[PDB]
Symmetry: D2
Subunit: 242 residues, 4 copies
């Protein structure tokens, strides 16, 4: 997370940490609890290559990474079949926990948006995670969960920004319809926030608008953060999630 | 270049080295002389972002990188407008030298293939460059130009190979029609060879079949080297090159 | 700490962490509370060059580094005047805290040994710290305080061990009288443990026998851990510490 | 080498490169040809630990490192028996080549100084090598042999300089009698120059005053380059070299 601050303990109960086996269970991506037994994440965190289920653990909301770990095994990794790169799209995946979680006030699910949902240019949206604090700048220990309010940038506006200082023809779509933009040069998601949530408050309800996917660097001029647009994958999510 | 050997001094007269300004004019990509004033390379070497022309130099065929440098300025960088990532495709670019080169026996152009040329399996093809000798293994000093004979793999066989050990749906094309596959677990191109040529001997004539583009690592099981298919961009090349 | 385990919360109340100002107050050396207002450490942690007092903080006993920091400023850094490198010796320093600490059961001083105490082989001795778990292997997050029981080696034997597989003449003393040896190929102190304590239980009292100083790597054959022998510097320590 | 320039082809015929076996025969230290079958170097380049003779090669004068390698095996590594660290001293070693070299105008021996030879300030002295061009700044390819004219500083003035901004007592000798100082903030030897020569022109004859040994960084204020004083080891050199 670029800019913003350490999240209050009561905020973002759906935030999860994805862990890889090694010298320690290291954080590699974020995610969100969307059902007591399901985690929503980015496909690029777990693919396109198939990896061993035993080498993965899920960690529920934690104020400080690694401090009070209670690691959860995964029974299934479901990666969107259209996925191979974040720039092509379909950067979405589902993790089925071996067991459902005991939902509380401090740890509970995020609401997915309705199929119609549009996120207008400049809505109140927040991105959260334990990712880098800037380009090649790690989140320092004790690794607090960070948050940052990010402005929505309309797809066409965002796509035109990606063409500034680039050779790509104006007629060539970089920001696809299954993608969403948010952030600026002071507020953004970064490496390590991938797979984590972009939540917008709509009519007093927090809705997950996006999944942290890609971009050119973090908080770079004319390069807003690119998110997987959740509404585009609602049917695919609902085929697996009750 | 993974496998193969140091190229004889009389071989590959069209091979060029792309140099970036810094503590020294460092090699970052390969290229090929296709006309006395034109270099063919990969778009990912010079894009998608526009960089300063002054920060780039072209070095003609050199036995050992850096030892007998005679650097050449560039007046134009022409990147295919469809390009943004090597995985999407259109990974091709043209560099116009400020001045034409004095063509000789040791330094001369490569022949582009006719539109009809397919390059089927069994064809004798060679990849050249000063790139990595294996994954995260730099070409050691004195940096000799290397070559490796690589087997051609049918696009469909290659696409199926890229689906092995991956979540990507079989109906999702990874290796596109504008791409070409070459290499195996002992013979391949690697980081630093990008932009360079894949040449095939057809009826006693060396034809540039491909441009080193991408792949998953270097000489990895079920991951052949992926090349930009030159024949697909002949009309675009001919719009700029006489 | 090589080998051993995470220390119980009730053990080693005198253990301190030395912190350097940067992106975060990073651990760089250990130390020990020898008086409510004095920290004993290694001179190589703070010298031979004079550094800014404002760039240093002391952290009292912490179960997990960085997680519950209450940083303490220093008013004086007193480095043994004989010191320039750990291999020559006099690798000892004193830090005067700006304020005395409120001593409790969980955080209190270690006892210095009497001048007569030699610590022969067979003495139960423990070395503690947040240093590397092996050669070029950092202590993983959440960074627990580790301990390891180490066997003492009599000086002349340790000096002769340092000559094995080395060109240094047998008559040339490597391990000096102001030094103490402890550890083997499974149990040792390592980078980041420097300045921290080696404590031995003598007549039901924990005495600080040494200060983690140097060695050739960590737990390497014929290279035991070298400590500054506390008894040798008692007069110098008493010139500053009540 | 910090400052100075690329050496002319006719200069420093005695300069050698020490090579270690790995992905390539990599330069790790310099040396000097003092006899057709003997190389003078620093003990720290080859010790204090004993390494395999097969893992070492000597490369004679080369304008550009790695370009025209003709590596030479070594039959004996003789390290001064007083050596363990460069800060203590006796940082000198001898390499006996398996075969003598065919001496020419481009490749020949350096003259050792007479025992009476003091090299006072004002004497024209050069240090040569393929080492770093500054602190953490590698010599760029094609790796030319560099030279730098360095001012001699008297030992007591140099000793006092090493005490500036350090805790070490003024009565504690850092720069020993078996050492020699040269260089300033614009001229110095650096990592990779170690073992190489410091030569002074005395009565039309080039004499090797020193062996690159140590210092605190490269071209740092109040930290001149420290050399092993050759005159101090003439008897030891003469035990082995005719
Ligand atoms: N700040 C949002 C965000 C969140 C998580 C991870 C990242 C990564 C994604 C990959 N990274 C890249 O630099 C990267 C990979 C591909 C591209 C291009 C691009 C681009 C730029 C101009 C025009 C067209 C393009 F495709 O950028 C590192 C940052 C970025
Ligand atoms: N061996 C030929 C070659 C020549 C030059 C440069 C490379 C690079 C290209 C980028 N690299 C990658 O590892 C890379 C970037 C994107 C992918 C995927 C993939 C993939 C795997 C299974 C299914 C679908 C995929 F897109 O791999 C490093 C090697 C490779
Ligand atoms: N296990 C003890 C320990 C505790 C804290 C920090 C270290 C460092 C000290 C410096 N290191 C070295 O490898 C080092 C620095 C100098 C020497 C030599 C030596 C030597 C070997 C044979 C004979 C004489 C010697 F002085 O080794 C890395 C670990 C080692
Ligand atoms: N003069 C340039 C030069 C040439 C060859 C090799 C080096 C090395 C020697 C080791 N290095 C150090 O930084 C180093 C190692 C030990 C010391 C201290 C010291 C010191 C400083 C003040 C007082 C007393 C000291 F012993 O410095 C890096 C470069 C430096």
């Amino acid at each position: 997370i670029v800019g913003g601050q350490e999240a209050p303990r009561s905020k973002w109960p759906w935030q999860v940490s994805l862990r890889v086996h090694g010298p320690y269970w290291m954080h590699f991506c974020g995610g969100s609890l969307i059902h007591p037994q399901w985690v929503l994440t980015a496909a690029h965190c777990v693919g396109p290559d198939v990896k061993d289920l035993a080498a993965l653990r899920v960690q529920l909301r934690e104020q400080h990474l690694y401090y009070q770990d209670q690691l959860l095994p995964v029974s299934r990794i479901i990666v969107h079949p259209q996925f191979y790169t974040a720039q092509i799209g379909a950067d979405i995946a589902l993790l089925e926990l071996e067991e459902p979680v005991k939902v509380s006030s401090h740890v509970h699910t995020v609401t997915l948006p309705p199929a119609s949902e549009t996120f207008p240019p400049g809505m109140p949206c927040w991105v959260t995670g334990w990712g880098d604090v800037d380009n090649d700048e790690r989140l320092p220990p004790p690794f607090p969960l960070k948050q940052v309010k990010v402005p929505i940038m309309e797809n066409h506006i965002c796509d035109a920004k990606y063409h500034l200082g680039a050779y790509t023809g104006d007629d060539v779509r970089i920001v696809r319809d299954d993608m969403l933009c948010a952030g600026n040069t002071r507020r953004d998601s970064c490496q390590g926030d991938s797979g984590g949530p972009l939540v917008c408050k709509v009519n007093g309800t927090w809705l997950q608008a996006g999944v942290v996917s890609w971009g050119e660097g973090c908080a770079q001029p004319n390069r807003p953060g690119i998110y997987t647009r959740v509404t585009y994958y609602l049917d695919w999510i609902h085929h697996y999630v009750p």
